[PDB]
Scaffold this motif. Structure first.
Motif, short mmCIF file in Angstrom:
data_model
loop_
_atom_site.label_atom_id
_atom_site.label_comp_id
_atom_site.label_asym_id
_atom_site.label_seq_id
_atom_site.Cartn_x
_atom_site.Cartn_y
_atom_site.Cartn_z
N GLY A 93 0.87 -1.19 0.00
CA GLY A 93 0.00 0.00 0.00
C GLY A 93 0.89 1.23 0.00
N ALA A 138 -1.09 -1.96 9.62
CA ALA A 138 -2.06 -0.87 9.59
C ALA A 138 -3.43 -1.40 9.16
N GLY A 157 -2.31 -0.83 -5.49
CA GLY A 157 -3.52 -1.32 -6.16
C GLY A 157 -3.57 -1.08 -7.65
N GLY A 158 -3.08 0.07 -8.10
CA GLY A 158 -3.15 0.43 -9.51
C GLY A 158 -3.93 1.70 -9.80
N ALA A 159 -4.82 2.09 -8.88
CA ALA A 159 -5.52 3.37 -9.01
C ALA A 159 -4.50 4.51 -9.08
N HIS A 160 -3.45 4.41 -8.27
CA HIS A 160 -2.38 5.41 -8.30
C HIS A 160 -1.10 4.80 -8.86
N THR A 191 1.20 3.74 -2.02
CA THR A 191 0.67 4.97 -2.59
C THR A 191 -0.40 5.64 -1.72
N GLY A 192 -0.73 5.04 -0.58
CA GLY A 192 -1.71 5.60 0.34
C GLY A 192 -1.07 6.49 1.40
N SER A 193 -1.90 6.99 2.31
CA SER A 193 -1.44 7.89 3.37
C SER A 193 -0.33 7.29 4.23
N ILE A 194 -0.58 6.11 4.81
CA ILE A 194 0.40 5.41 5.66
C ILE A 194 1.66 5.05 4.87
N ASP A 236 -1.33 2.07 14.16
CA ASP A 236 -2.23 3.16 14.47
C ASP A 236 -1.93 3.78 15.83
N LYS A 277 -6.71 -2.81 8.97
CA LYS A 277 -7.62 -3.17 10.06
C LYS A 277 -8.26 -4.54 9.86
N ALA A 326 -0.01 -1.77 4.82
CA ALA A 326 -0.85 -0.60 4.80
C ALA A 326 -1.89 -0.72 3.68
N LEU A 327 -2.23 -1.96 3.30
CA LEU A 327 -3.28 -2.20 2.32
C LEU A 327 -4.64 -1.86 2.92
N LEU A 354 -8.53 -7.22 1.22
CA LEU A 354 -7.37 -7.72 0.48
C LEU A 354 -6.02 -7.57 1.20
N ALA A 361 -1.83 -4.85 -8.27
CA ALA A 361 -2.98 -5.76 -8.23
C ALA A 361 -3.82 -5.72 -9.50
N1 LIG Z 1 -4.69 6.92 7.71
C1 LIG Z 1 -4.66 6.59 9.02
O1 LIG Z 1 -4.18 7.35 9.83
C2 LIG Z 1 -5.20 5.35 9.46
C3 LIG Z 1 -4.99 4.18 8.83
N2 LIG Z 1 -5.69 3.04 9.20
C4 LIG Z 1 -5.85 1.96 8.21
O2 LIG Z 1 -4.55 1.58 7.63
C5 LIG Z 1 -4.76 1.25 6.20
C6 LIG Z 1 -3.83 2.08 5.33
O3 LIG Z 1 -3.98 3.46 5.70
P1 LIG Z 1 -4.16 4.39 4.36
O4 LIG Z 1 -2.72 4.70 3.71
O5 LIG Z 1 -4.81 5.65 4.74
O6 LIG Z 1 -5.09 3.62 3.26
P2 LIG Z 1 -5.14 4.32 1.77
O7 LIG Z 1 -6.51 4.13 1.23
O8 LIG Z 1 -4.78 5.89 1.83
O9 LIG Z 1 -4.06 3.54 0.80
C7 LIG Z 1 -4.48 2.16 0.54
C8 LIG Z 1 -3.34 1.41 -0.29
O10 LIG Z 1 -3.78 0.09 -0.68
C9 LIG Z 1 -3.55 -0.09 -2.08
N3 LIG Z 1 -4.47 -1.11 -2.66
C10 LIG Z 1 -5.79 -0.98 -2.91
N4 LIG Z 1 -6.30 -2.13 -3.44
C11 LIG Z 1 -5.29 -3.01 -3.54
C12 LIG Z 1 -5.11 -4.42 -4.01
N5 LIG Z 1 -6.14 -5.14 -4.51
N6 LIG Z 1 -3.87 -4.97 -3.93
C13 LIG Z 1 -2.81 -4.28 -3.45
N7 LIG Z 1 -2.90 -3.01 -3.01
C14 LIG Z 1 -4.08 -2.34 -3.02
C15 LIG Z 1 -3.72 1.30 -2.65
O11 LIG Z 1 -3.15 1.47 -3.96
P3 LIG Z 1 -3.83 2.52 -4.98
O12 LIG Z 1 -3.66 3.86 -4.28
O13 LIG Z 1 -3.03 2.39 -6.26
O14 LIG Z 1 -5.27 2.07 -5.07
C16 LIG Z 1 -3.06 2.17 -1.59
O15 LIG Z 1 -1.64 2.27 -1.81
C17 LIG Z 1 -6.21 1.65 5.85
O16 LIG Z 1 -7.01 0.50 5.53
C18 LIG Z 1 -6.74 2.39 7.06
O17 LIG Z 1 -8.10 2.04 7.29
C19 LIG Z 1 -6.25 2.94 10.48
C20 LIG Z 1 -6.48 3.99 11.21
C21 LIG Z 1 -6.15 5.36 10.64
#
Ligand SMILES: NC(=O)C1=CN([C@@H]2O[C@H](COP(=O)(O)OP(=O)(O)OC[C@H]3O[C@@H](n4cnc5c(N)ncnc54)[C@H](OP(=O)(O)O)[C@@H]3O)[C@@H](O)[C@H]2O)C=CC1
Ligand SMILES: NC(=O)C1=CN([C@@H]2O[C@H](COP(=O)(O)OP(=O)(O)OC[C@H]3O[C@@H](n4cnc5c(N)ncnc54)[C@H](OP(=O)(O)O)[C@@H]3O)[C@@H](O)[C@H]2O)C=CC1
Ligand SMILES: O=CN(O)CCCP(=O)(O)O
Ligand SMILES: [Mn+2]
Ligand SMILES: [Mn+2]
Lengths: 379, 379
Positions: free
Chosen positions: A9, A116, A37-40, A11-14, A141, A118, A93-94, A98, A59
Motif C-alpha cells: 500500500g 495498519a 492497487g493500480g488506481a495510483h 501509494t496511500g497515506s500510511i 495506528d 484493520k 498498509a493495504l 485484500l 494488483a
Molecule cells: N490513515 C490513518 O491514519 C489510518 C490508517 N488506518 C488503516 O490503515 C490502512 C492504510 O492506511 P491508508 O494509507 O490511509 O489507506 P489508503 O486508502 O490511503 O491507501 C491504501 C493502499 O492500498 C492499495 N491497494 C488498494 N487495493 C489493492 C489491491 N487489490 N492490492 C494491493 N494493493 C491495493 C492502494 O493502492 P492505490 O492507491 O493504487 O489504489 C493504496 O496504496 C487503511 O485500511 C486504514 O483504514 C487505520 C487507522 C487510521
C-alpha cells in the motif's frame, strides 16, 4: 543494522508517510519491495524511479498492462511479492479485505509485521492470531502504538485496564435529537484527496473506536470488560494503561502519524527526530469526558461482537461498511448506521464459529453485507 | 518471603502512610524498626503496639526517657538503628538534612533505600552516590517515582528530556508584590497534597521543586539543561519523560503518596490496590502552564547550585532550612526565603569542592547556616 522493509500500500497515506520516514533514515531502513492497487499507478512508477526499487507489485491487471515490466501483477500480486522477497519488516498498509492474505503470507515468512490494515485483525481474527508468534505483529495506528508503549510500564500480570482515547468526532456531546439531522457533509464526507470518506464517518459514528477496541483485544490479550474508552478532544494523549496499583501510564504527542509509523518500523527502537514532542512553553489543557453510550452505542456493540468471537467481528465491520455507504447515499439517516449494525449482529449467531480459512471470513462478510442491505431497503 | 522494612520517621506524614501500606500487605512487607524524633509519643506508642515492634529509635533524650526501654536514643539513634537491624528495605522518611547519616548507613548495609528524605541526597550529593550500588536508591517522591516508571518507555540513549510537574503551590499566579504579604498561615495551605508544615512551605516557595530538580539529576544522571519543570495545578500527572522520537510517556494518578511509597517498598513489583486510579467515567482536565521564574526563581537557583556541584547543593538546602525557620517564626517575609538562598549561594565559592567525607558536607552546611543567619540579621 539496516532493516529491509516491504511497503504494501505504498501509494496511500500510511505508505507514503512510511517512505518519508525511510528516506529520512537510510541508516535504519531500506525499501526492498513496494505494492499498490493500480488506481495510483503513476505514483508507484515514480516511487520505482525515485527509490530504485524494481521489486514492485500491482494488483489491477488493466493498470499493469500500461507498464510491461512489473514483476508481480494481478490478484495476489502483493502476496506473491511478500512470499518471494527477503525482508525484516513488512508494512501492511493495504486497505480492506485484500490485506488479509498478505498479512498471513508475511507472518509465514517470519518477518516482523507492521500492521495498519484493520481487516487483518477485525475480520481475520483467530486466523491471524493463530498464525502470528508473540511480538511478531506491531500495530501502526496511534492508539495501539500508544498502548504498546504504555505496556512497558509493568508486566502483563500488572495490567488492570487499557484506556483508548477517542476524539469524539464532530458530534461530540450531541444529543440523540441532534444526531437525527446529521448530513453526509457534516459527517466529514468531503472529497478529501488522501483519506476516503469512510474514515471521517467511522470516527463520527464511533465505529472506528469500536474497531480499535476489537483490535486492542486481539493485539494485547486483554478482556473486553477491561478495555475502556475516554473522549479526549485534543488527541494529545493517544491512549493509556492503568496498572493494578492504581498507576496510569500515558503516551502523549502532538498529532502526527509519523511517530507511530516510525516506531512500528523500528520496533523496539525509537527513531530519532520522527516527530515533534509536546511543548510546555505555552499554557494548555488536556480534557477528558465520558462517552454517552446511549447516544453512541458503537463501542458497546463492538465489545458484544468481540466477546461472541469467531467471525462476529467480521460481521460487525461488514455491516458497518454497508450501512455507512447507505448513509452517504442518503438511503438512511445517521443514527440508523449503528442501528443496522445491531440488527445484523443480533441475527448473526451462526458466525460465532472460528474461521478455518480466508473463505470462511469472506462468507461471513458476504452474509453481513446482504443482511445489512435487506435492513436498509426494507426487504 | 516478606521484605523486612525499617521505617525512619514513622510518625510523620510519609511514615504513617507507609505503615498503612505495610499493614494492608503483610504477605509482602513487615516492619522491623521504627525511628522518630520524640515530639509525638502518642503516635509512636500506638505504632509500637500495632506493629509489635520494640526495635525503636527516639532522637530526643528526654522523650525517650519518658517512654522507657527505648533501645536507641539520642541524635545518632536513627543511624544506629539502621546499622544494627537486619532489613531488606530502609524507608527514610525523616525530614531535613539530618537524614544524611541514616541514608549513608542504610546504603552501607546493602539494603534498598526507599528514599522520601530527598534532602539527604540533595545534601550528600556525590558522597551518597558513591555509597550506592546502581538502583539501590529508590525514590518515594511522587515525581521521581513517576520518572522511574516512564523511563521504562525506552532505553537510556533514547531519553531526550525529563519533565517534572509542579503544583505551583497556593501562590501560583501571584505577583512579586502579592508575595510580600504572605503569612505563615497562608503558606501552610496546599491545594493538592497533605504534608508536614516544612514540606508545605517548600512547596509554596518552590524550593521543594528546586530540591526535586537536584534529586532528578542525582538519581538519573541527566544533565540540568535536560530537566524541565512545568506547572500542573491538578497534580494528577506526576512527571513525564520525552524520548528522541517525540514521544512523551507520563505517569498519572489522583494525588496519593501511598502509590509511590508502595512501589518504592516493593520495587520493581507493583502493589495491588495501593491507591485509587484515575477515573475516566467523569469529566476532568489536566492543565499545564509555564513556571513564572521571575516571581519564583528557586528552581533556577537549584540548577545553579547543581551545576556548581560538590557541596553546593548542601549549601542550597541548609540556607533554605534556616531561612524557612525564620519565616515560620515571623522574623522575615515570604520573599526573603529565596532571597536569602540566593545571597548565601552567591557567597559560597569554596563549596564547589566534591565531598570526600560526611564531615565535608557538615562543614558546608555549618557555613551555610551561619551565612543564612547573617542574611537574616541584616533584615
Ligand atoms: N490513515 C490513518 O491514519 C489510518 C490508517 N488506518 C488503516 O490503515 C490502512 C492504510 O492506511 P491508508 O494509507 O490511509 O489507506 P489508503 O486508502 O490511503 O491507501 C491504501 C493502499 O492500498 C492499495 N491497494 C488498494 N487495493 C489493492 C489491491 N487489490 N492490492 C494491493 N494493493 C491495493 C492502494 O493502492 P492505490 O492507491 O493504487 O489504489 C493504496 O496504496 C487503511 O485500511 C486504514 O483504514 C487505520 C487507522 C487510521
Ligand atoms: N508528606 C509528603 O506527602 C511528602 C514528603 N516528602 C518527603 O518525605 C520526607 C518526610 O516528610 P514528611 O513525612 O512530610 O515529614 P513529617 O514532618 O510529617 O515527618 C517527619 C518525621 O521525622 C521525625 N523526626 C523529626 N526530627 C527527627 C530527628 N532529629 N531524628 C529522628 N526523627 C526525626 C518526626 O518524628 P516526630 O515528629 O514524631 O518527633 C516524623 O516522624 C521529607 O524529606 C519530604 O520532603 C516527599 C513527598 C511528599
Ligand atoms: O512528591 C510529592 N510532593 O513532594 C508534593 C509536591 C507538591 P509541589 O509540586 O507543589 O512541590
Ligand atoms: Mn486511530
Ligand atoms: Mn515531590
Amino acid at each position: 543494522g539496516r532493516l529491509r522493509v516491504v511497503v504494501l500500500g505504498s501509494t496511500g497515506s500510511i505508505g507514503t508517510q512510511a517512505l518519508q520516514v525511510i528516506a529520512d533514515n537510510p541508516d535504519r531502513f531500506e525499501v526492498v519491495g513496494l505494492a499498490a492497487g493500480g488506481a495510483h499507478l503513476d505514483t508507484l512508477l515514480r516511487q520505482r524511479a525515485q527509490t530504485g526499487v524494481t521489486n514492485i507489485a500491482v494488483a489491477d491487471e488493466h493498470a499493469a498492462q500500461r507498464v510491461g515490466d512489473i514483476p508481480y501483477h494481478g490478484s495476489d500480486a502483493a502476496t506473491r511479492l511478500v512470499e518471494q522477497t527477503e525482508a525484516d519488516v513488512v508494512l501492511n498498509a493495504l486497505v480492506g479485505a485484500l490485506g488479509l492474505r498478505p498479512t498471513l503470507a508475511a507472518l509465514k515468512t517470519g518477518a516482523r509485521l507492521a500492521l495498519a490494515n484493520k481487516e487483518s485483525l477485525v475480520a481475520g481474527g483467530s486466523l491471524v492470531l493463530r498464525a502470528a508468534r508473540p511480538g511478531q505483529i506491531v500495530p501502526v495506528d496511534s492508539e495501539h502504538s500508544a498502548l504498546a508503549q504504555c505496556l512497558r510500564g509493568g508486566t502483563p500480570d500488572e495490567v488492570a485496564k487499557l484506556v483508548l482515547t477517542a476524539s469524539g468526532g464532530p458530534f461530540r456531546g450531541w444529543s440523540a435529537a441532534d444526531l437525527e439531522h446529521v448530513t453526509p457533509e457534516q459527517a466529514g464526507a468531503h472529497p478529501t484527496w488522501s483519506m476516503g470518506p469512510m474514515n471521517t464517518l467511522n470516527s463520527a459514528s464511533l465505529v472506528n473506536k469500536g474497531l480499535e477496541v476489537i483490535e486492542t483485544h486481539l493485539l494485547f490479550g486483554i478482556p473486553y470488560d477491561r478495555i475502556d474508552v475516554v473522549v479526549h478532544p485534543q488527541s494529545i494523549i493517544h491512549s493509556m494503561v492503568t496498572f493494578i496499583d492504581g498507576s496510569t501510564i500515558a503516551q502523549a504527542s502532538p498529532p502526527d502519524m509519523k511517530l507511530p509509523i516510525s516506531l512500528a518500523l523500528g520496533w523496539p527502537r525509537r527513531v530519532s527526530g520522527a516527530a515533534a514532542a509536546c511543548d510546555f512553553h505555552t499554557a494548555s489543557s488536556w480534557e477528558f469526558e465520558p462517552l454517552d453510550t446511549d447516544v453512541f452505542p458503537a463501542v458497546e456493540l463492538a465489545r458484544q461482537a468481540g466477546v461472541a468471537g469467531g467471525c462476529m467481528t467480521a460481521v460487525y465491520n461488514a455491516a458497518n461498511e454497508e450501512a455507512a455507504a447507505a448513509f452517504l447515499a442518503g438511503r438512511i439517516g445517521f443514527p440508523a448506521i449503528v442501528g443496522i449494525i445491531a440488527d445484523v449482529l443480533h441475527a448473526a449467531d451462526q458466525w460465532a464459529v472460528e474461521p478455518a480459512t480466508v473463505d470462511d471470513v469472506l462468507d461471513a462478510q458476504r452474509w453481513a453485507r446482504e443482511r445489512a442491505q435487506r435492513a436498509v431497503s426494507g426487504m
